[model samples]
Target: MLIIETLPLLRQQIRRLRMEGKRVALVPTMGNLHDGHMKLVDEAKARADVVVVSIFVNPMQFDRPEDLARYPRTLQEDCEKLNKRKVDLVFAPSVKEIYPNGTETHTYVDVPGLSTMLEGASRPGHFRGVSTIVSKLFNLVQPDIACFGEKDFQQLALIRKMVADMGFDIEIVGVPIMRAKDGLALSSRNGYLTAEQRKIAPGLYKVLSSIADKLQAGERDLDEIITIAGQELNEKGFRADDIQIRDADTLLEVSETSKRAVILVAAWLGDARLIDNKMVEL
Candidate 1:
């Protein structure tokens, strides 16, 4: 329920918690709360004594200025939701406070090749922005553990790589993706969909489910599966960004011997650029 917007005050609060020997769990998010986000908070609460949720719509992680400009800033409603959930601290800082030197000038914590390919490749420096802001949050909060939604599996993987490679002693937890009854993965950006665009949006999930079903049933024609999948989305009036069935762990193209795979898709339906993934095991 406590919202601290300045960095010094936030750090001062963290120090108080540390001195009191409270185990802290940090959940970093961009504003515009959703059920998927609440799932993350639940996980954080279970593992640590104090839960700190940092809500900053990081301008650095956004690829398009237009995209960043339009993202919802329902801070009051977001805080109200967090308050009801009994979150201990909410660190909602100004952009200038987080990026005093400017986004372009700030140092980034990138995860090498992992941060550059597949989902990361689509948005150029997107993962770097993600990892960078997260690393900044890690440094700022210095929490004992942090949780992220599995909806962003690649982003979760990149953060794990960053923590290991950089030697940050924090546990990274990925909570499962929460979905609508219709099967579409929940996302804050889903708000961008107009009435009917929301209706057809689950086609994104439908396509992914079909792909996962095929892969789950040992459909070996990975190449053809994606071709038809992309064609289906395009004909359904959604613009194809990319459709990939990849190794679940490596996020690379699945080979003949690969044991587990994931179907990952990013597509545009109207103004919403939605991404979702399903894990496949054989």
Candidate 2:
């Protein structure tokens, strides 16, 4: 696979590929590749003639400076993983390349209402940073389609809304969440867990599943349901941050009459903050 760093070279290469009538698919990520990321690239390969995976640890998305500084960047190992896949190019740009004027002066994009709750509320200005980097990627790659993992459901939903509002024309594809054998949703942050913390991490998914089952079985008291989930997480050693059930598409809080619902959770486990969600047919 080819590794590209500069925007001009990437644009020139993409233009050359366009001349050959090849369709491109983009899989944007913040390094630290794992099985989940590989699955996204695989999904991209099946849909387009060429797949371009961009690995940049976006500093703009982190609410805490410490969190941004602590984020893992394993580009060499990430590239080794991608080399086995059918990726045509890897766009790994430096911080200067992505934001030459620095994040302070960068023209950022935001998805208003959707950006103010759940993960947004937890990490202020988080989605704005996400949308900003993703918008930049969409502009730079100009791919026919872009693939995102359902593990970060809120991020996927927000990106879809951004694409529609901005008229990007690129198809946004969300691949299903890939999990470990025990069902903890695969995440780059998973690497931060201690051995004991890893053992307790799967409880997050269990709580989400139980909540989803209750919702599907005709339980509409969201308040009671959310309370149960929080209590369950606490019993299992997770510090429940937020367990909310919302409209699947818009991320808005939903009522009992709502048809489709998504249960989103963010909890603290040791030093790692893990998030997961499950969709319900309520």
Candidate 3:
């Protein structure tokens, strides 16, 4: 696999590939790769002639210094994983390369009312940083297709909106979330889990699953589902920060039952703050 840091060379090379009518698939990521990411790589390979994966831990996204400090960065290992997965090219840029001097600007994009709840409420400017970096990468790679993991369901939806809004002529794909055998959604943060924390983390998924089970069984009240879920997480020894039953499309909290709603939860176990969600549809 080819590795390039300079954007000009990378852009020139990608343009040449496209000139040859080679289809390009872009997978954007931060380092510290996991199974979830490999799945994206595999999906891209299936759909495109050449795949480019960019790994840059953007600084503009972090709201907390401590969180940024703790975010994992095993670049060598991550590259190895991508190489084994047969990625065609990797663009791992320095922060300086991506955001040059005096680049103190933030661009926020969202799905209208969808920006105020769930992941939006948890991280504040997080999605804005996500959108800004993605916009930059889309320009840099200009791939015929870009694939994002549905593990970040909200961010995936918003990106689809913003890309269309800005008139980027590319196919955007949201692949389904991949999970571990135990049902915990695969994430880079799963590396931060202590042994004890790991033991209890699956309960997050279980709680979400239970809510869906209850809803499927004719239990229709949003508050009742969330209160039970919050208490279950708390009793299982985690601090339940928020359990929102909101509109799946707009993310505004829903009062009446309908064909669609999302159960979003954030909780702290040990030193790791984890978030997970489930969607209910009739």
- Backbone N/Cα/C clashes per model: 0, 0, 0
**TM-scores across all candidates?**
0.73, 0.75, 0.71
- What would the per-residue lDDT of candidate 2 be over residues 13-73, giving only the tens digit for each residue? 9999889999999999999988878999999999999999999989898878899889998
Local accuracy of candidate 3 as per-residue lDDT tens digits, 95-175: 778877623564544445445466678877777778888888988898989998766768776787787788999898877
TM-score for candidate 2: 0.75
Worst 10 residues of 1 by lDDT: 240-249
- Per-residue alpha-carbon lDDT of model 1 for 1-282, expressed as tens digits? 789999899989999998999999999999899777888998999999999999999998888999999999999999999888889999999998988888998998778888778767788888889989998999999999999877677887788788988999999887768889898887779888888998999899888888888888878798899889999899888895598777766677787787778677999997679998887676
Candidate 1 clash figure, as a count? 0
For model 3, give the 10-residue run with minimal summed lDDT: 102-111
Ordered list by lDDT, greatest first: 2, 1, 3
What stretches of model 3 exceed 4 Å from their correct place? 64-70, 105-124, 180-244, 254-261, 265-276, 280-282
Better of 2 and 3 by lDDT: 2
Ranking by TM-score: 2, 1, 3
Cα deviation at 201, candidate 1, in Å, is 13
